[PDB]
């Protein structure tokens, strides 16, 4: 019931938030399904950050994989999860979010 | 086929993986070790109806076609059976598409869990490349 309030803009998600729970809200900038790893990148500013939210079999609750499957590029989502400081491909930004909740506000 | 470590390193190097998307060759060798134990015939069925195939455990939902996974996209345009042979060409061609998808080698859970942040170049030590 009722999506939680955004605590941070995607640009504010930095390695110094490591271990903190955050809520980000914005649109699906990118989807990657590699089997055991699925990654949804969320942006909330044009030309902005695209924070990767990582789903990993064995780690992420199963029910969130069912929600990932309903996702499309440009859907508006709200995601609650824990920040993890870690090297990203092609970015100096260095963060991912391990999700505990994924809400789909609406389906662009 | 079960590859030797140096033997797989040389074959990956001939296939252009050293520094492919900025990933040095030991990354690829370390990934194969933890994904397949260097066994080209490795096949692992997941609870979600997809299966992972070959030396780099490529998944049947998006990447190869095994004819039995719902929502199959076949982005590498290859049947999954091609990924089980003694020769790594097909697995490599498909891994290059996966590593270019926009998340680098974070697409392989065993690379995240066992390779990332470790001495990856140790995987090619003593190999005559």
């Amino acid at each position: 019931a009722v999506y939680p309030k955004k605590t941070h803009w995607t640009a504010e998600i930095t390695p110094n938030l490591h271990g903190s729970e955050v809520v980000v809200a914005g649109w699906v900038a990118h989807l990657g399904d590699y089997g055991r790893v699925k990654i949804v990148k969320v942006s909330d500013r044009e030309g902005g950050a695209a924070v990767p939210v990582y789903l990993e079999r064995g780690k992420t609750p199963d029910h969130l994989f069912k929600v990932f499957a309903e996702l499309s590029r440009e859907d508006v989502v709200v995601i609650k999860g824990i920040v993890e400081a870690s090297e990203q491909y092609g970015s100096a930004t260095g963060v991912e979010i391990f999700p505990s909740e994924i809400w789909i506000l609406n389906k662009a | 086929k079960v590859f030797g470590r140096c033997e797989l390193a040389a074959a990956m190097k001939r296939h252009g993986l050293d520094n492919y998307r900025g990933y040095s060759l030991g990354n690829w060798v370390c990934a194969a070790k933890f994904e397949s134990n260097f066994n080209t015939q490795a096949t692992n069925r997941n609870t979600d109806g997809s299966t992972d195939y070959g030396i780099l455990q490529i998944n049947s939902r998006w990447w190869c076609n095994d004819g039995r996974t719902p929502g199959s996209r076949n982005l590498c345009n290859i049947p999954c059976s091609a990924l089980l042979s003694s020769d790594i060409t097909a697995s490599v061609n498909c891994a290059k598409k996966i590593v270019s998808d926009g998340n680098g080698m974070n697409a392989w859970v065993a690379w995240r869990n066992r390779c990332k942040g470790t001495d990856v170049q140790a995987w090619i030590r003593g190999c005559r490349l």
Side-chain angles (χ1 to χ4, degrees), chain A residues 1-4 6-108, chain B:
Chain A
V2 176
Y3 60 26
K6 169 170 154 175
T7 61
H8 294 79
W9 293 85
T10 55
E12 293 177 312
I13 303 304
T14 66
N16 199 44
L17 276 178
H18 182 78
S20 289
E21 179 168 75
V22 303
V23 177
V24 289
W27 61 86
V28 175
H30 189 265
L31 293 165
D33 183 325
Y34 310 108
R36 294 166 280 169
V37 174
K38 303 190 214 294
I39 298 164
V40 53
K41 284 177 187 188
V42 177
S43 290
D44 51 14
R45 189 175 175 237
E46 307 299 335
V51 62
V53 174
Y54 268 74
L55 291 85
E56 170 179 329
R57 285 286 183 189
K59 180 202 177 48
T60 302
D62 281 336
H63 68 271
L64 301 173
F65 283 94
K66 301 177 216 208
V67 179
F68 182 90
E70 293 174 85
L71 258 13
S72 282
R73 232 187 207 169
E74 298 293 322
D75 285 350
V76 177
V77 298
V78 168
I79 296 179
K80 178 186 281 185
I82 301 300
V83 177
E84 162 88 356
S86 80
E87 49 169 325
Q88 296 309 298
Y89 173 71
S91 174
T93 66
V95 292
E96 36 193 62
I97 289 176
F98 294 156
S100 68
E101 302 177 15
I102 301 174
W103 304 78
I104 306 165
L105 298 200
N106 57 322
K107 304 280 193 57
Chain B
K1 171 179 174 154
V2 184
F3 269 81
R5 174 178 61 83
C6 288
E7 177 192 4
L8 185 67
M12 290 177 153
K13 188 182 212 287
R14 277 180 308 255
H15 275 105
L17 285 178
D18 187 16
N19 295 310
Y20 190 88
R21 294 306 174 203
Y23 290 99
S24 68
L25 186 64
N27 290 280
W28 298 99
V29 180
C30 182
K33 174 54 180 185
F34 292 101
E35 285 295 357
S36 66
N37 205 17
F38 301 147
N39 173 12
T40 65
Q41 291 182 308
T43 301
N44 290 290
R45 299 190 288 280
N46 297 302
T47 43
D48 73 351
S50 74
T51 299
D52 298 311
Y53 293 88
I55 196 104
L56 284 164
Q57 293 288 281
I58 292 176
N59 190 248
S60 68
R61 182 90 62 194
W62 278 27
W63 301 98
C64 62
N65 186 20
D66 66 8
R68 72 174 185 196
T69 309
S72 182
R73 301 243 262 147
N74 195 12
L75 294 170
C76 297
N77 188 30
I78 197 85
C80 299
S81 37
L83 305 182
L84 300 174
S85 75
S86 60
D87 177 282
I88 65 163
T89 305
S91 285
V92 172
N93 280 342
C94 188
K96 294 173 176 175
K97 289 188 173 67
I98 288 173
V99 79
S100 303
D101 190 51
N103 296 289
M105 292 189 73
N106 294 289
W108 281 280
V109 67
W111 178 82
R112 289 174 57 80
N113 290 355
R114 303 282 177 201
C115 300
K116 187 177 183 179
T118 77
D119 185 1
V120 294
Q121 282 301 81
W123 286 95
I124 67 157
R125 76 192 176 181
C127 309
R128 296 171 113 271
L129 283 346

